[PDB]
Amino acid sequence: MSICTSEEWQGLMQFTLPVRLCKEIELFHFDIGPFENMWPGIFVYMVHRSCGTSCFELEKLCRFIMSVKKNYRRVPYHNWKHAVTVAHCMYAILQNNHTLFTDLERKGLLIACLCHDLDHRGFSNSYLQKFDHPLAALYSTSTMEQHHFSQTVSILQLEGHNIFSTLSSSEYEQVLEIIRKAIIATDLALYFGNRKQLEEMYQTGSLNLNNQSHRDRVIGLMMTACDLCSVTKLWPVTKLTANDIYAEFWAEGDEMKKLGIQPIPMMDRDKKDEVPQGQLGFYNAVAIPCYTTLTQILPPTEPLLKACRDNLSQWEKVIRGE
Numbered sequence: 001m002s003i004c005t006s007e008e009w010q011g012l013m014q015f016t017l018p019v020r021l022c023k024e025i026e027l028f029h030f031d032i033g034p035f036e037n038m039w040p041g042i043f044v045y046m047v048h049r050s051c052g053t054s055c056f057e058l059e060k061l062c063r064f065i066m067s068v069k070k071n072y073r074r075v076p077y078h079n080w081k082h083a084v085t086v087a088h089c090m091y092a093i094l095q096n097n098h099t100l101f102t103d104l105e106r107k108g109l110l111i112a113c114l115c116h117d118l119d120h121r122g123f124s125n126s127y128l129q130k131f132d133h134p135l136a137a138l139y140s141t142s143t144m145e146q147h148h149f150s151q152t153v154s155i156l157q158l159e160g161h162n163i164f165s166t167l168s169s170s171e172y173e174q175v176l177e178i179i180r181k182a183i184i185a186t187d188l189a190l191y192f193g194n195r196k197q198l199e200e201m202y203q204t205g206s207l208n209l210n211n212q213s214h215r216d217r218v219i220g221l222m223m224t225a226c227d228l229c230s231v232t233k234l235w236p237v238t239k240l241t242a243n244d245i246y247a248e249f250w251a252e253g254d255e256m257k258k259l260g261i262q263p264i265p266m267m268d269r270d271k272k273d274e275v276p277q278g279q280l281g282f283y284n285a286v287a288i289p290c291y292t293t294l295t296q297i298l299p300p301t302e303p304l305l306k307a308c309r310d311n312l313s314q315w316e317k318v319i320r321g322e
């Protein structure tokens with residue numbers, strides 16, 4: 001594991017967020033894009049506002065964040081910027097549904113979101129579970145997600161990085177379990193079944209947040225919603241992020257080609273023309289249903305569904321040639 005320097009965390013400790021950002025960070029639509037240097041500080045701020053200034057020891061939190069950043073790779077999409085975008089969306093959901101979640105869950109989710117794609121290499125689970133890379137042998141299913149959780153624990157195990165050490169033995173194992181299930185939920189393969197079960201529970205009136213299995217599922221859907229959140233930004237931001245997503249997809253197709261294997265259209269750079277149709281397909285089958293079910297369970301999350309609907313409309317315009 002890569003460790004942060006003394007200057008990085010001490011600098012973060014000293015960091016103060018400008019006044020104008022305080023109001024904007026509360027909004028679902030907020031884009032972290034223009035404030036790169038402020039990203040670690042934005043996370044500290046969100047943790048302090050949701051959990052409290054004394055929830056974690058400042059020094060441990062700043063060492064933890066700075067080492068988490070160092071363990072994200074310089075890949076086009078599944079990087080540090082993605083981690084912070086996902087954490088911000090979680091913050092907006094938690095702020096708008098505050099008392100539905102325990103202090104331990106809010107702490108656990110904000111941390112899980114920042115750590116959810118730790119050490120990502122820009123390669124899918126399918127790629128690993130085919131050309132049997134060591135990771136797929138270690139983790140048969142949700143390959144990268146089990147690795148992201150393993151990396152989260154290894155960062156906590158670094159000297160003076162354990163932010164949860166002050167919790168009781170029961171609360172510490174609970175927080176890790178919240179984190180583990182949250183990170184596993186970000187395996188898109190699991191989302192489809194999770195949303196269907198949630199749709200059924202809500203529709204029949206079976207859904208019950210005091211039921212731990214129901215609670216685990218709702219958290220899971222929140223994880224997908226935060227993971228997918230670039231589809232809820234303003235069109236220029238959404239469009240530019242989509243270019244990073246496909247840069248990784250095409251690079252996977254390129255590595256497949258070098259190894260003598262034909263990639264799917266989505267991962268084929270010689271098939272760029274099919275992208276708008278693939279995105280419409282993605283919004284209709286994955287994104288729109290995700291935000292629709294989430295809005296049903298947590299009504300204050302409706303602006304995410306509206307923003308996703310606007311971007312679906314922008315992909316439709318691209319298709320018709322407008």
Ligand SMILES: COc1cc(F)cc2c1nc(C)c1c(C)nc(-c3ccncc3C)n12
Binds near residue numbers: 188228229266282
């Ligand atoms: C066909 O269009 C896609 C296929 C796909 F599989 C994943 C896609 C995706 N289009 C978008 C916009 C997108 C966003 C924001 N996030 C993800 C995502 C979620 C989980 N794991 C990896 C990715 C890339 N996707």
Ligand SMILES: [Cl-]
Binds near residue numbers: 001002071119151
């Ligand atoms: Cl690493």
Ligand SMILES: [Mg+2]
Binds near residue numbers: 116117144186187
């Ligand atoms: Mg992931």
Ligand SMILES: [Zn+2]
Binds near residue numbers: 082116117227
């Ligand atoms: Zn992700």
